[PDB]
Write a protein that binds this ligand. Structure first.
Ligand SMILES: [Mg+2]
Ligand SMILES: [Mg+2]
Ligand SMILES: [Mg+2]
Ligand SMILES: [Mg+2]
Ligand SMILES: [Mg+2]
Ligand SMILES: [Mg+2]
Ligand SMILES: [Mg+2]
Ligand SMILES: [Mg+2]
Ligand SMILES: [Mg+2]
Ligand SMILES: [Mg+2]
Ligand SMILES: [Mg+2]
Ligand SMILES: [Mg+2]
Ligand SMILES: [Mg+2]
Lengths: 226, 50, 63, 97, 25, 127
RNA sequence: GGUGAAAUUCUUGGAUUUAUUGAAGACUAACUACUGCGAAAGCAUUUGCCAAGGACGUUUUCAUUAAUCAAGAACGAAAGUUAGGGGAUCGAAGAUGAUCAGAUACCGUCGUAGUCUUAACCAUAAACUAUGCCGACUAGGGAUCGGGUGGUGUUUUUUUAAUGACCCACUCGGCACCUUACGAGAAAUCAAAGUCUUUGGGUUCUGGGGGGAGUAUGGUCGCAAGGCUGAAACUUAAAGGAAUUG
């Protein structure tokens, strides 16, 4: 597997880490921790502008790291670099997601899997797609073993959930949402509307993803990194 | 079906072309008869992959 | 040329097509409370000490 | 003669079952007739847990698990130390081990 | 031989016998 | 305190990829595979080869400066087996015992929502 | 990269791998069940519109309008045909590497038709429950799906009502399941394959030893492939079903 290369060049050494400089990743204000970590970029030459070679980066961080508490252990968070100033490259919220093990954990058989997504736009003209998931549960004292919904509660469940998701988005620009997913207020608020329909355990909502972003508005981002 | 005086493909004791009917893009007037600057020939098979 | 001296704590059984290779779980003398399972060619008993030219592999235990 | 009452499968009132592919040899097999097994295992080992703990920040992290639903065909299951073969009276038992 | 391929062998034979008989009418 | 990285171990049959990256992932450090350590063309997926590959990833990290890594185990995924290869799990053990620190272990195998079609034909791969 | 192992193949022109995007077409995972719907074929993301349907409930209406059916008609998997769109993936053919005594196969890499869709054909399948439809009766038991009834039954609202979801009892209809053999069967097995020498509820279709043979021929339908109908000469003493012991 080593000495089996027929040829290396179709037509026919310098250490790359002696020309690299580290930076610092900063999380927005709506997070307990700001020291995400560090990144690697070559030094900016005259025609390279290594700051430009860094602007589009996106970093994935666990919410348990930002909040310091393992209650958000799964809770994946994506932060997108928006501005670079003095070794302190600044990121903004880019998307929340679930770890694979957590999503694979909740999906069990002999219970119904109910999903809902919305294409609602925020107050700050951010366009978001919010995904919601919930599972049925057996009532206390229940004897039958599957506890399946009747595909008509599920429509009612999905319809009510879709109203909650859009409503909690319109009226909040981007940081209220980021500070609403942290306490899981939407998850607690969904149950109170769907409890009279059917039990619905495990309402950990789902990933959220950005669709299109507004004009850069460098003043707004600096308002977070106060 | 022509005489050699009339067309490049003219002439012969049988009706044929005699040379490849794919022509260069750099040919001149009087030479660009047939398939001009053809990237391929023959029956098209599969997706064009445009 | 670092070599490792590990001590047998319990024999598991005979593996291999002919059964000539014994499956035994041993314990490291230095840095104890760490155990590895190894395949041994010859006759092995309890409390034996094994030399491992390379001691970073969990040998394939039949189960 | 008719070997089994269900004859291979769990199709009584389905007509068609829209098959699934075998995970070992890509053979097409109806989903009811498939031999689904669920594989839920810890992320590392029963032996690497000793070394992945002290070498980890966030002490006692989660020891997460992996979840996977495997489908086997009739041939792939018998060859893989699975449902292989039983006696005529043992064939009727549907209880898992 | 397999009944499937005896069906296939006979169909090919009927192709030719439908073709050699067309040479006359 | 600790400079973090991403292990990005690709456990598969016939090979094993171990290569650390930045927290963003764009910049890569110490990409060495299992097939670079053993000349068999058959032992590429072996746990020993992945263990040797995992050691070289760790050795370069200290020189670069990275002291701890995050871990992402991956199988082939898609319409393929989705089961991690034999050596990918041994590579993770070698990473942990080499002096680096581990956090945020995750399985990142790509799973489809009943994707296009699996190769092999209807009757399967008859061998 | 692939394999039991390799080779064809791709790589310093950066292969594989990592990250950010974009396009295309196909599919509808996990949830998924000895569960549901449909005449069968068949049908699994969300929402909107259109028409349909079974069961249940009913002190509504009509009143025998019914059951099964030659002829005849609608629908009818996959593959295939015609013409457009589309053409990611897989992939009859073909090209290649390998295995082999050979290997025009199984394994590997490519890869055309096809796969997807629109308009029209084809009319087949182990299209199977290998079990025609309608009707009555005959043993027990639990579970489940849909509807309904009853119970000061449990929990959530507004401690509190009604609903919703559960629990208990009954019931009508459905998909099946467990035990036994009154009975049936050559047996395997069967709550129907039972109520059949104590032989008759109504009705449709098909078979009469094994080959030749679903072949020839003549018709008829199809663009074609082919479909439906369908012999004879000849030949033979056994083929065949279920179980038994090796
Ligand atoms: Mg048999
Ligand atoms: Mg590259
Ligand atoms: Mg259902
Ligand atoms: Mg779906
Ligand atoms: Mg009738
Ligand atoms: Mg037929
Ligand atoms: Mg059918
Ligand atoms: Mg019932
Ligand atoms: Mg009921
Ligand atoms: Mg039913
Ligand atoms: Mg007779
Ligand atoms: Mg006869
Ligand atoms: Mg027999």
């Amino acid at each position: 597997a080593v000495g089996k290369n027929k040829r290396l060049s179709k037509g026919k050494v310098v250490d790359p880490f002696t020309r690299k400089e580290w930076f610092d990743i900063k999380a927005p204000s709506t997070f307990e921790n700001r020291n995400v970590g560090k990144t690697l970029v070559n030094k900016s030459t005259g025609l390279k502008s290594a700051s430009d070679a860094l602007k589009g980066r996106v970093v994935e961080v666990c919410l348990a790291d930002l909040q310091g508490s393992e209650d958000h252990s799964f809770r994946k968070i994506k932060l997108r670099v928006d501005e670079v100033q003095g070794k302190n490259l600044l990121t903004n919220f880019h998307g929340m997601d679930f770890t694979t093990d957590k999503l694979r954990s909740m999906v069990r058989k002999w219970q119904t899997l109910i999903e809902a997504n919305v294409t609602v736009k925020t107050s700050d003209d951010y366009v978001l797609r919010i995904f919601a998931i919930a599972f049925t549960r057996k009532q206390a004292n229940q004897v039958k073993r599957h506890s399946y919904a009747q595909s008509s509660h599920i429509r009612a469940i999905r319809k009510v959930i879709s109203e909650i998701l859009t409503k909690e988005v319109q009226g909040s620009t981007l940081a209220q949402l980021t500070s609403k997913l942290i306490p899981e207020v939407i998850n607690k608020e969904i149950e109170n509307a769907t409890k009279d329909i059917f039990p619905l355990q495990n309402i950990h909502v789902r990933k959220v993803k950005l669709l299109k972003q507004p004009k850069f508005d460098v003043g707004a981002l600096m308002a977070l990194h106060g | 079906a022509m005489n050699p005086v009339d067309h490049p493909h003219g002439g012969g004791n049988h009706q044929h072309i005699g040379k490849a009917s794919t022509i260069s893009r750099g040919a001149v007037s009087g030479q660009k008869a047939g398939l001009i600057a053809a990237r391929r020939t023959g029956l098209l098979r599969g997706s064009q992959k445009t | 040329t670092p070599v490792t001296l590990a001590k047998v704590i319990k024999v598991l059984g005979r593996t291999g097509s002919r059964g000539g290779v014994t499956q035994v779980r041993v314990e490291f003398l230095e840095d104890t409370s760490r155990t590895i399972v190894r395949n041994v060619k010859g006759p092995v008993r309890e409390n034996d000490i094994l030399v491992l030219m390379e001691s970073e592999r969990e040998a394939r235990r039949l189960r | 003669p008719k070997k089994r009452a269900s004859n291979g499968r769990n199709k009584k009132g389905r007509g068609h079952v829209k098959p699934v592919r075998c995970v070992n040899c890509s053979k097409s097999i109806p989903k009811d007739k498939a031999i689904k097994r669920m594989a839920i295992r810890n992320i590392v080992e029963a032996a690497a847990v000793r070394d992945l703990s002290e070498a980890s920040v966030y002490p006692e992290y989660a020891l997460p698990k992996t979840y996977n639903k495997l489908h086997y065909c009739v041939s792939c299951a018998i060859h893989a130390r699975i449902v292989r073969v039983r006696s005529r009276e043992d064939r009727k038992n549907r209880a898992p081990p | 031989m397999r009944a499937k391929w005896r069906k296939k062998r006979t169909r090919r034979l009927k192709r030719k016998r439908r073709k050699v008989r067309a040479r006359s009418k | 305190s600790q400079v973090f990285g991403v292990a990005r171990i690709y456990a598969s049959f016939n090979d094993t990829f171990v290569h650390v990256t930045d927290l963003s992932g764009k910049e890569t450090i110490a990409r060495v595979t299992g097939g670079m350590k053993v000349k068999a063309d058959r032992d590429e997926s072996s746990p020993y080869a992945a263990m040797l590959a995992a050691q070289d990833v760790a050795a370069k990290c200290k020189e670069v400066g990275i002291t701890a890594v995050h871990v992402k185990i991956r199988a082939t995924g898609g319409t393929r087996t989705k089961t991690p290869g034999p050596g990918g799990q041994a590579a993770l053990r070698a990473l942990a015992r080499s002096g680096l620190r581990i956090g945020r272990i995750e399985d990142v195998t790509p799973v489809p929502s009943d994707s296009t079609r699996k190769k092999g034909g209807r009757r399967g791969r008859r061998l």
